[PDB]
Amino acid sequence: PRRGWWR
Amino acid sequence: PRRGWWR
Amino acid sequence: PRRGWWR
Amino acid sequence: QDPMFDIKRKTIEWGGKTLVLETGRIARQADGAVLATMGETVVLATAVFAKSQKPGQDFFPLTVNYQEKTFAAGKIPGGFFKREGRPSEKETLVSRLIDRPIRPLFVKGFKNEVQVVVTVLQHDLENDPDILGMVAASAALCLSGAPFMGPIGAARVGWVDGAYVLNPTLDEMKESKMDLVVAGTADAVMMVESEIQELSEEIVLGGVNFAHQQMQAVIDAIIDLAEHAAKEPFAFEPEDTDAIKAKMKDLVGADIAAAYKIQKKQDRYEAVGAAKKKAIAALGLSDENPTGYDPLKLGAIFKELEADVVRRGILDTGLRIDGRDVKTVRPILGEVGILPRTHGSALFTRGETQAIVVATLGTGDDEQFIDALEGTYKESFLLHYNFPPYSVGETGRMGSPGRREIGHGKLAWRALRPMLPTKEDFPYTIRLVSEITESNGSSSMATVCGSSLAMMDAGVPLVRPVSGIAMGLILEQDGFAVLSDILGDEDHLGDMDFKVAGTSEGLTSLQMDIKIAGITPAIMEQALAQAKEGRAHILGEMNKAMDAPRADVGDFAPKSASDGAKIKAAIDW
Amino acid sequence: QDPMFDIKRKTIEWGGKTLVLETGRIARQADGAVLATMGETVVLATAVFAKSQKPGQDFFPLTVNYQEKTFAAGKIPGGFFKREGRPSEKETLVSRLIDRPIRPLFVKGFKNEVQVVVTVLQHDLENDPDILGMVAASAALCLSGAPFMGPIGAARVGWVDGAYVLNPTLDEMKESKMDLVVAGTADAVMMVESEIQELSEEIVLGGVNFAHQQMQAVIDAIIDLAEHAAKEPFAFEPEDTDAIKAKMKDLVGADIAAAYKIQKKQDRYEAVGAAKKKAIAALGLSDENPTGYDPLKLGAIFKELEADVVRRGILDTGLRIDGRDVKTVRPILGEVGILPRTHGSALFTRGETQAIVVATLGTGDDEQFIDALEGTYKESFLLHYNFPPYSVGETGRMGSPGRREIGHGKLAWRALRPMLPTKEDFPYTIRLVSEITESNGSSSMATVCGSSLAMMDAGVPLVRPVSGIAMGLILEQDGFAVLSDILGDEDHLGDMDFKVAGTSEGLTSLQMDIKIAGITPAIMEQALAQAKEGRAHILGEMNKAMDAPRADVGDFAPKSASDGAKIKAAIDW
Amino acid sequence: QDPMFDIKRKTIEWGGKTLVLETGRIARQADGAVLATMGETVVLATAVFAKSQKPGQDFFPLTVNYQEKTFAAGKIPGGFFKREGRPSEKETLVSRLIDRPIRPLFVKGFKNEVQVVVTVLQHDLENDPDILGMVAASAALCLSGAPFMGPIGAARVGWVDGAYVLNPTLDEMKESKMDLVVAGTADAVMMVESEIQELSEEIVLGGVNFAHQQMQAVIDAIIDLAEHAAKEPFAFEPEDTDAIKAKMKDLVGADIAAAYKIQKKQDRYEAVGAAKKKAIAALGLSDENPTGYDPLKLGAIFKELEADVVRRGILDTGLRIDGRDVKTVRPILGEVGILPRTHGSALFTRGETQAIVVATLGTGDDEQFIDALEGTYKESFLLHYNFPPYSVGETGRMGSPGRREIGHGKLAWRALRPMLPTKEDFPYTIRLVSEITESNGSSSMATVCGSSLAMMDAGVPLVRPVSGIAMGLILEQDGFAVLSDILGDEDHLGDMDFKVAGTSEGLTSLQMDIKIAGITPAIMEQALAQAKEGRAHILGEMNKAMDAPRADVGDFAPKSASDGAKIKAAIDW
């Protein structure tokens, strides 16, 4: 899971 | 006499 | 020669 | 051909001290100026206001500068530049003491620049000029003609030999077990700031009430001086916005009420914004349909409305914004030893307000020189309070502590100090610093809490733990509610904010800021009784963590040295 | 392939000292840059100007920074940070010395940012770099191409052994009885700043005139350097607003003249505003009727007009705005002992300008360390001048004294110092601080007056009282008027502002700021003669209050101790 | 009922030291907050961002504050106020160390306020918190949800006993011959800052590459912590301006290319502006012809374009803006003894960048006290770097050096220091100050150059001269160019800026700032090889001026005294 900007 | 804001 | 503001 | 039309109110033996108020000689170009004398301490106070409003104001721009000139005490400054420079600690606190009770007395809706300065010219080494500065600023303000609904009086009250003593002198304060400064109108106490040796709510409240009775003579004197010497009152009527309020009320009113009954954060919002954007459309928006009222001025009036409603919802049922009863305190957890190498450290969390507090111990080198007019002296309890903007999820400028941060540190300093051990039993200097890492209502009681904990964690033999709480009041014509441990945004939604701190034996500091008339001593009696319930509770949650001081000081550090081995080396040496 | 096209003007033995002006090696990216040397003191001066005007300028944004680098004298700074930081006193005064005579020489109407910096690189411990800085900045400005009608020359003049001495060295100044710095164009002296041992108007004026003759060689050198090295002159024509002035004149002209003949404050206004709003309507307002001129730009031109008229009304009759004759001084009252516990105190009022001045005495600990390039030294006469905004009925920021406040204190310091007793006859440090409580023209002579009084009130054995006055001139092609004790707003209405201070024996300080050519030494001779009448008058009004020093110093305070009893204890000890 | 949902990544023995990252207990109101521990040093880092863009932003407003609390080391501050105040030198450098590699990783086009603060809470006297601060800020940023393409790792690398040592402790650094701090993403080293004892490009590059490999574990840990604990990613798409770029390209593209082929300054401009104003007209201007794109947003896209072209023109042919080949260094001239009375002085000019550098010598009194957490110590090499605005032909505010000026002084300090003589062979304190009098690309290597020269000119027995150069890279998918001695405006036109300084034996300082992925160690190997050619060249031009130290110190000044006569007097005494 977990979705953001560090990819 | 004397008329202002402190009343 | 040389032309400016100090005259 | 006489210059200077002086007018004086000299009469006032004021509790066995002469108070003169003079005007018309000095600073004639200011709106109001008063040379005020009490015994032989003299300050000049002046008041100036702009005769129009800067475009797009917002808020009411008041500024207050109290400042001491060292010539007032026959000395040159000690700095390398031998001129006075940036405000000292005492000068900041005092400016804040004058600002606090003036700010709300200015007519609602008035938003021209107003500046008050108070300059200490002579100091008699007995009568504090800080109380005189307050009286003086009040006087200068009534005389100026600004829309200021004063005057305020002010007074210090001590507790010596089992009696209130009015305006005690510097020598009298040495033997006093309370330092209470109050400021009020004729109708209402408006502000209290204090440091107390564990004395009961009844006695502290007694002192407030006393100050209120005894300050009346000054208020009377100021009116007497005003009546002979004031300038033309500045005309300023505020806006009978009063009208379309009734309007939008009946409309979105029932809407807003049940809107607040929705729980689930989001949605709750949602409903509110709907209600706004609504009555906004067909109301005040003007264009498309006149008319109208300038929209977004209709917003202001709305906020007023949701506030009235939030206020009503509270009084019927005891339910708040976050779902608490007016008596409920937010969950708490306190924890010590969080920075094991630091002399003593604590984390304190109450709800969404959090403080990391660490304590360091040092020696004579570490005391702070403060050169006051009244005498130069060393200070060994230091408390520095830091309110970074990340604590409210915001960005802002760092370094250089403001009026607000100086004042909070102060209000915790006053809470903790009555309880330090004596120099003889514990010869250390104590610096506490406190970093507010989350803030949502009382970060400064948090630092009182954190600070007990950090100090016991450092092995400072505090004679008793201390805890503090911050409280609000909703007052209406049919009832009132006292709020326990207020949320930061409830703060602007009450008529009175106060914080109480103390031990299991009695108070240690009471701070109050009142916005309107009608708080009866009956109503304060309750308010302080509910606070007592709260601080006892909070203290209980704190004992889960530490309870009593550690017996010894941290490994690092000192005594002196960090090693007992180096101490014994020196001793043997 | 040669970088750096250097051009020098080396010639100028300038009164027995070599002055080199160098350009084209250093700081090539600045508009003008000059490395200037005199003896072995070196400064670099640079001049930069924006090539366009910020939108909605207003006024002419010039800034000047003189700064000393301590490497110029082979030392590291003494501060805890060992870097130079905020300007010192000397660095502020000097920046002000350069700014004063440049500011008016920039073409009327030019409002682009202009910055001049002057950095002291080497100090030979003899030739002051402050005069060199002035010459250097002038040079850099002519070379830069900015619309600057210079150059200015500058010079110090001393008075030793009964003769003027040009640019005296630091050792020469020790034996000099005058410290006169002048700056001027080829046509006109533009600025004078001085401290004098009670020397007559004729001798002081002699010195000015001398500086003016002797600075011509530098002006000639700067033109020589300019002619070989200057950049293209920046084109900038100002606005032949010259035209519609004639217009609005003939119109509201007779109107404005009799408008001023009305007395009664109010009404007088009234008439003026009528006149404005009038010619405004059918003139420059444009819309409704083109055209037009942008209104409120027609306002600017009006002000110019009422000014010309006020100026004419003065020259015909000797009548002013407030009703005085050009010779009349405002009513005065001086009063001492106003703060009895302070070492010495005075209140001084001239018209609407007022100063509270208090004097404190201290010892060796209280002298100020100043570490100058030229040598580190202790300073025992201190004068701090404080201009709070309430003095003009305004609000503004407090703390941190500006260029203006440093400079006034300075101008009073120079007035009073020649008259202190000697260290041998009176071993004290003297700090005077002065709070301007009302300001309407010369608060800085007020502080000179107040300061005599406060010092005599403290028992400082001044060898003679001193008084000062501030003066203006209206100069036209057909006549001139010298104004005595100018009102603050007359200040911007004259061609020349000066202040003279001194004793009953001669001058002590003369400060001048001239805005235009044509002040003849004949005209200054008068101007100084009318000032002499004024200061004598003012001194007379001051003697009504104190006259001579008290014989002893105040109860508090010192000698040392405040008790003679503690002194005798120590002595016996 | 558990407050605080803590999440930890504890695992990471990181080169024999435990690194814990904690979140969810502290500072819950910040966007990301991380308590990070390495050994026993603890910092808290927090990250907050505005959820919308201020109107008319421009640029990306990031600010970073690293700050040390002295309680972190068990001490009270030494200042007279005993509170921490303005940033120290170490606190400024560190804030700059964190800012440099974060700034470019934020998504192009994002312009909301972002603030990061890092507060040192405990210091174990071994592990530096500056590296921890970097890791911590990275961690807090990934967790916050801001459009930040991190994380970054960071590491210090030492060189002891002929091997790289990871994160050496304070005692280990004493025996290390390199101090290399690197920061990078998983893909790319992004920043390097170092001080080196004359070690070769291969070894220094080895260290960089090492740090890059060894920092991967922290990056992995941060992603692990992010995956369990991050907030919702803030949505932000940038603008497919990508489209009308293609447009305006094909149009003014061939135009712009041959525009740059024109030489003659003026004209060259001329052509460019034509090209702009052109494609502006029938393109993006909108009105008259929709549509359109908001003009002047079409300007932004143009600049991008001329930049791409300038970048291409460079890669085909090796020709630059000013006409140099990618290898050419600007003409140089260095000159000493320019201020003969100053202890040592130099003027250094490379092209349009110029520095006046003067050296002063002093004794024990002149060393700077710096009280660091880690221990209090004295500092005897001082270098102060001053970047006045006249150097770029501009006006701006003077006094008070910024982040940029502190950091440059630092980068020269690190270049020169490895080469000072030892205290035993030369017991002086050395203050260098450097005034940049013209700036157009590397004023800070200029000051390194000037500083060699000034010190030899002062007779400081430097073991070897040092010179520095500043370099850029244009990197494309088909090739790259390394630029030698970059012009100031080429600075914003490359993918990588670095500066290298050293002696004829090896490096002394390497500083790098990389803006994008893809710089291979092969590409750095070249880049450093071309720089080596440059600094050797530059050193050669510098020897024309001084070559070796003078044998003796300047006449003025000291030893101590300025006279040998006064020294012998004392000695005999």
Residue numbers in the entry:
A (entry chain F), B (entry chain F), C (entry chain F): 891 to 897
D (entry chain A), E (entry chain A), F (entry chain A): -2 to 556, 600 to 613
Structure paper excerpt:
The phosphorolytic exoribonuclease polynucleotide phosphorylase (PNPase; EC 2.7.7.8) is encoded in the genomes of bacteria and eukaryotes, and in those domains of life the ribonuclease plays multifaceted roles in regulation and environmental response. While the C-terminal RNase PH-like domain catalyses phosphorolytic attack of RNA, the N-terminal domain has lost this capacity; instead, it contributes to the ring-like quaternary structure of the trimeric PNPase assembly. Two recurrent structural motifs that are found in many RNA-binding proteins, the S1 and K-homology (KH) domains, are appended at the C-terminus of PNPase. The PNPase studied here is from the bacterium Caulobacter crescentus, which has been established as a model system to investigate cell cycle progression, because populations can be readily prepared that are synchronized in the cell cycle.
